[PDB]
Amino acid sequence: EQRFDYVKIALASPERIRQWGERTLPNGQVVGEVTKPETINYRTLKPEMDGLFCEKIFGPAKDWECHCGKYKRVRHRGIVCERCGVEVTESRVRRHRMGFIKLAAPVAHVWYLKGIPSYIAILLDMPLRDVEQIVYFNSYVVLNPGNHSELQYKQLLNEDQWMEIEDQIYAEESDLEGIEVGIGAEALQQLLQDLNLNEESEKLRQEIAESKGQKRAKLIKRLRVIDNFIGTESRPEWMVLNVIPVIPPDLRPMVQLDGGRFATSDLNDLYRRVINRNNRLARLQEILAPEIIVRNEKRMLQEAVDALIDNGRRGRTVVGANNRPLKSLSDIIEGKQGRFRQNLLGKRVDYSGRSVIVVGPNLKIHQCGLPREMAIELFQPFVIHRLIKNHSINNIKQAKKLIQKNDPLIWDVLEEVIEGHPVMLNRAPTLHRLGIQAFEPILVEGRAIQLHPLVCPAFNADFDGDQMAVHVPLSIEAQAEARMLMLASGNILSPATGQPIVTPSQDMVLGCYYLTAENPGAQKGAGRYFANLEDAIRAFEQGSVDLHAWVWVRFDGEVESEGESDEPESVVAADDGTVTKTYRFRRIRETEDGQRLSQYVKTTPGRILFNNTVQTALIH
Amino acid sequence: AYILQELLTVKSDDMQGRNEALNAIVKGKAIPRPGTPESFKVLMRELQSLCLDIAVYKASTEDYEEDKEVDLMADVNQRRTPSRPTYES
Amino acid sequence: LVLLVFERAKTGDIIQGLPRIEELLEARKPKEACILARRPGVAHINYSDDDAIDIQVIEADGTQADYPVGPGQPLIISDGETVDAGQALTDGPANPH
Amino acid sequence: ATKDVATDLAGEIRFQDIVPEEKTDRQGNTTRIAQRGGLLWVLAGDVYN
Amino acid sequence: KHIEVIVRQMTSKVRIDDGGDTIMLPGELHELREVYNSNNTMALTGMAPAQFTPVLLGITKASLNTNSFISAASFQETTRVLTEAAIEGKSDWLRGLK
RNA sequence: AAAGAGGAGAGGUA
Ligand SMILES: Nc1ccn([C@@H]2O[C@H](COP(=O)(O)OP(=O)(O)OP(=O)(O)O)[C@@H](O)[C@H]2O)c(=O)n1
Numbered sequence: 001e002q003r004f005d006y007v008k009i010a011l012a013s014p015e016r017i018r019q020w021g022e023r024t025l026p027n028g029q030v031v032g033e034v035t036k037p038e039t040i041n042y043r044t045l046k047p048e049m050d051g052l053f054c055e056k057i058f059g060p061a062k063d064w065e066c067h068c069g070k071y072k073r074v075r076h077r078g079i080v081c082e083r084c085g086v087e088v089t090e091s092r093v094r095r096h097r098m099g100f101i102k103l104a105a106p107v108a109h110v111w112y113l114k115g116i117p118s119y120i121a122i123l124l125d126m127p128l129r130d131v132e133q134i135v136y137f138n139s140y141v142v143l144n145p146g147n148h149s150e151l152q153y154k155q156l157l158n159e160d161q162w163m164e165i166e167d168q169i170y171a172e173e174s175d176l177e178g179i180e181v182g183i184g185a186e187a188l189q190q191l192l193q194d195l196n197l198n199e200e201s202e203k204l205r206q207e208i209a210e211s212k213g214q215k216r217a218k219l220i221k222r223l224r225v226i227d228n229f230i231g232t233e234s235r236p237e238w239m240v241l242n243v244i245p246v247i248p249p250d251l252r253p254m255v256q257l258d259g260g261r262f263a264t265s266d267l268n269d270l271y272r273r274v275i276n277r278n279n280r281l282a283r284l285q286e287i288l289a290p291e292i293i294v295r296n297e298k299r300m301l302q303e304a305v306d307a308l309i310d311n312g313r314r315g316r317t318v319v320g321a322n323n324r325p326l327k328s329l330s331d332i333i334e335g336k337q338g339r340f341r342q343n344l345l346g347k348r349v350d351y352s353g354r355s356v357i358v359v360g361p362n363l364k365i366h367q368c369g370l371p372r373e374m375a376i377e378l379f380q381p382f383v384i385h386r387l388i389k390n391h392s393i394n395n396i397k398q399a400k401k402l403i404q405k406n407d408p409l410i411w412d413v414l415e416e417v418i419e420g421h422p423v424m425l426n427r428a429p430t431l432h433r434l435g436i437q438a439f440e441p442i443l444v445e446g447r448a449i450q451l452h453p454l455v456c457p458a459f460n461a462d463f464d465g466d467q468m469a470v471h472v473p474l475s476i477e478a479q480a481e482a483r484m485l486m487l488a489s490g491n492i493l494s495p496a497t498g499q500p501i502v503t504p505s506q507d508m509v510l511g512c513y514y515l516t517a518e519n520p521g522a523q524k525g526a527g528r529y530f531a532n533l534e535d536a537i538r539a540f541e542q543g544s545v546d547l548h549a550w551v552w553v554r555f556d557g558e559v560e561s562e563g564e565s566d567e568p569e570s571v572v573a574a575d576d577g578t579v580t581k582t583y584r585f586r587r588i589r590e591t592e593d594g595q596r597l598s599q600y601v602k603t604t605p606g607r608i609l610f611n612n613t614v615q616t617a618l619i620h
Numbered sequence: 621a622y623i624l625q626e627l628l629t630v631k632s633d634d635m636q637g638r639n640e641a642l643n644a645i646v647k648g649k650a651i652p653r654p655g656t657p658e659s660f661k662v663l664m665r666e667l668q669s670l671c672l673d674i675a676v677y678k679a680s681t682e683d684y685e686e687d688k689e690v691d692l693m694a695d696v697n698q699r700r701t702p703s704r705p706t707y708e709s
Numbered sequence: 710l711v712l713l714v715f716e717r718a719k720t721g722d723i724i725q726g727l728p729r730i731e732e733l734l735e736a737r738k739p740k741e742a743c744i745l746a747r748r749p750g751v752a753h754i755n756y757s758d759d760d761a762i763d764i765q766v767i768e769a770d771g772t773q774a775d776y777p778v779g780p781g782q783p784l785i786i787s788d789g790e791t792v793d794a795g796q797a798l799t800d801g802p803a804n805p806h
Numbered sequence: 807a808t809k810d811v812a813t814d815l816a817g818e819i820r821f822q823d824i825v826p827e828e829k830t831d832r833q834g835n836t837t838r839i840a841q842r843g844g845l846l847w848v849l850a851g852d853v854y855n
Numbered sequence: 856k857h858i859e860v861i862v863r864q865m866t867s868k869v870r871i872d873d874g875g876d877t878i879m880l881p882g883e884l885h886e887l888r889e890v891y892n893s894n895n896t897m898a899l900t901g902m903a904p905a906q907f908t909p910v911l912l913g914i915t916k917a918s919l920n921t922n923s924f925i926s927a928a929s930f931q932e933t934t935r936v937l938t939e940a941a942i943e944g945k946s947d948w949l950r951g952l953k
Numbered sequence: 954a955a956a957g958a959g960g961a962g963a964g965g966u967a
């Protein structure tokens with residue numbers, strides 16, 4: 001059945017981060033750590049050996065060819081060359097494999113420090129300003145009060161005050177041997193490692209009851225977070241980073257345009273800055289530098305990591321060549337141009353076209369007109385299949401040559417390839433589901449698409465510059481759905497309100513109004529008598545009667561008029577029990593309290609034409 | 621639903637389903653079922669780069685056995701995956 | 710001399726209609742309306758001096774409520790009328806919260 | 807909306823039916839509001855400052 | 856019908872006050888039917904039920920309180936939603952469109 | 954066998 005059932009997200013431990021980007025080789029060594037800010041050689045366009053584009057960590061750059069050019073071919077199924085360590089396989093592996101960087105000093109994740117709720121500050125029960133001051137090397141914190149009388153646990157200090165306490169302790173006096181541990185550094189991992197979740201949970205639960213108001217609510221908030229860390233069995237100190245993942249190199253390409261130079265990518269610059277700062281800090285720490293220069297390097301490393309994660313969230317923004325900020329990892333998934341709203345909820349597709357639309361009368365409501373140049377391109381595989389199967393050619397290459405050379409036979413094949421295959425038409429602003437519709441195409445000569453006039457209001461389109469897009473279904477299920485769910489001859493009512501949507505619109509209304517109107521002038525042939533509805537039409541086609549004359553016609557059926565009087569205007573009773581009743585627009589003959597014998601209607605030839613057309617259309 | 625599913629996967633970025641669909645159309649056979657689009661995998665890698673533990677899991681049918689993580693970036697069928705669709709032979 | 714305070718005159722048209730819909734569908738706070746907070750159902754307008762209108766709503770048990778009216782709040786009820794809980798008294802857009 | 811009213815004369819002021827009212831804020835400032843409107847008369851003269 | 860369908864989504868929750876012993880902390884928003892069913896099951900033995908107050912949410916506040924973090928992350932405020940989901944260890948069972 | 958990589962400005966059409 002299905003490969004997976006659900007997705008889960010959680011915090012990442014350093015062990016998992018290391019496990020993501022570490023692989024072993026049949027030698028006993030392990031690879032995966034990046035230790036150089038180098039990408040490729042300038043002389044020969046090949047990657048370096050331990051940089052951001054290395055082949056031992058991420059994979060070969062050419063199919064079935066190792067770095068030193070000594071193993072090739074496909075018969076090997078996963079052996080490793082024993083001169084450079086490059087595995088011999090396809091280059092697609094460059095789209096999955098990850099790396100990692102080991103930091104000289106711990107740094108704090110900026111998502112958990114600068115947020116609408118601050119999770120580190122809430123967990124530690126300290127204001128955000130104090131936590132921000134401990135980080136970035138602006139103050140000290142008392143990790144252990146010792147046997148002092150004024151010092152308190154988690155108390156902010158200063159340089160002068162620390163100097164005073166240092167003078168007090170270093171006076172070689174007594175009663176101060178309580179091991180005062182005041183460390184102004186990251187120093188957050190130590191505070192987060194001293195937390196006992198169960199004891200704090202019990203204490204908060206006990207203290208909740210004897211409280212009220214805004215004092216209670218705050219405590220409640222803290223309690224929430226704490227219980228979360230018990231449900232997931234996570235460690236609160238995982239919010240401080242010791243290892244950093246590195247994205248696969250095929251998602252941040254280098255690109256070899258510019259003739260002699262190279263393209264610019266923004267992730268590579270941030271990674272290079274992080275690596276440079278880490279290497280400098282490690283080298284300074286190795287040779288036992290004075291501990292006033294090391295803290296500077298630690299601060300710059302923290303700022304570099306912060307800029308890599310989220311640019312401009314905390315302090316100043318990193319600026320490239322021109323005064324333009326760089327793109328960090330959080331800018332790829334954030335907004336209208338992010339991954340979610342641009343590449344996942346909408347896409348570009350194959351087998352699609354676009355062109356200008358003109359008006360085609362004499363079409364049917366389920367038909368459309370397609371130019372041949374577009375059709376020969378949108379239906380290529382079907383034409384190739386029909387050329388191979390019928391009119392046996394040989395292979396695909398001969399068919400492609402025939403199509404390119406424009407032999408007259410391909411048009412005869414295409415005329416029957418497209419017969420019975422629906423197509424989908426779309427206009428740019430799709431405000432409701434009637435903006436996409438399915439039609440049956442017929443080939444036309446020209447470069448414009450022909451559209452039926454009766455479907456324009458649904459699309460909201462007129463013929464003064466608009467353009468349309470065309471899509472082709474492929475599978476049998478898609479064709480069945482297009483025929484039975486979206487065909488343009490079955491969309492009669494509006495989903496918003498059950499009202500008609502295919503009414504005649506602009507000139508048909510004017511013609512039907514002129515046909516059935518009144519005209520006191522031009523009354524030629526008025527007063528004549530007719531039988532059937534066809535005699536009046538036949539007399540009209542001979543020019544013997546006008547279009548707006550008043551004539552009497554023999555009609556048996558239901559008739560409605562305008563301003564007709566329900567009262568019989570005249571009644572005449574004759575012998576043998578017969579009665580004639582004359583209304584404004586009718587004349588009826590009846591027997592003695594029985595059935596009708598005849599009925600004549602006073603009307604106009606245009607109204608007869610309209611009603612005859614309607615009646616005839618409902619029998620075919 | 622089938623029109624939408626075919627639009628989203630076979631015609632845009634299912635790197636293996638494109639060639640299968642093209643060759644099935646040429647040979648006149650049925651179009652095989654799709655797989656997973658590439659953009660989802662790209663998004664998963666980008667999210668993992670931010671130190672987030674996100675993965676897909678398969679439910680345990682029976683017994684006490686825990687749910688097992690599924691490797692999305694692995695090959696299921698022993699068939700080629702070229703960059704662009706081509707007419708084989 | 711003085712500073713007159715008034716309401717500007719605007720047109721109809723769809724541009725001035727959608728904001729009301731957006732305000733309604735977002736459950737935001739309007740700038741008017743006075744709502745009666747109890748059942749009773751006997752209201753006395755009690756026109757006082759210098760146009761100080763105070764509505765007094767009297768329960769069957771004798772409660773008084775005593776809702777006061779503002780200077781520019783029109784009334785939409787009469788004297789001796791029966792009113793229900795949550796029923797508007799002095800016009801305007803009701804606060805749904 | 808608000809609109810100021812100015813005068814094109816210079817002289818003494820008289821009230822016909824306007825009835826002032828005093829209101830205070832939460833800081834100690836006072837402003838005067840016309841409870842009942844009417845006519846404000848300016849009588850001509852020569853004003854020395 | 857369309858307006859009723861839209862309005863129903865914003866008048867169907869309740870805010871929990873001092874839940875007695877069930878897993879319902881004060882300050883949370885829960886469906887009315889779920890709370891009713893939980894109280895009906897719990898009161899069968901005879902323990903103390905929870906209190907609640909009805910609320911009216913709004914079109915954008917109600918859509919950010921969904922059960923799936925994937926659909927809420929693709930609407931607005933990606934980073935905050937993802938941070939909260941990672942802290943809470945949420946999972947998504949892939950129900951509904953989007 | 955091969956073949957385009959992104960970004961930033963300015964101006965237009967439904
Ligand atoms: N900013 C814009 C401008 C135009 N349009 C689209 O283009 C149409 C404009 O049609 P146009 O031919 O310019 O004007 P009409 O209103 O159709 O009037 P007429 O053709 O009679 O000039 C709009 O209705 C809409 O479908 C849009 O979506 N957004």
Ligand SMILES: [Mg+2]
Nearest residue numbers: 462463464465
């Ligand atoms: Mg137009």
Ligand SMILES: [Zn+2]
Nearest residue numbers: 066068081084
């Ligand atoms: Zn080698």
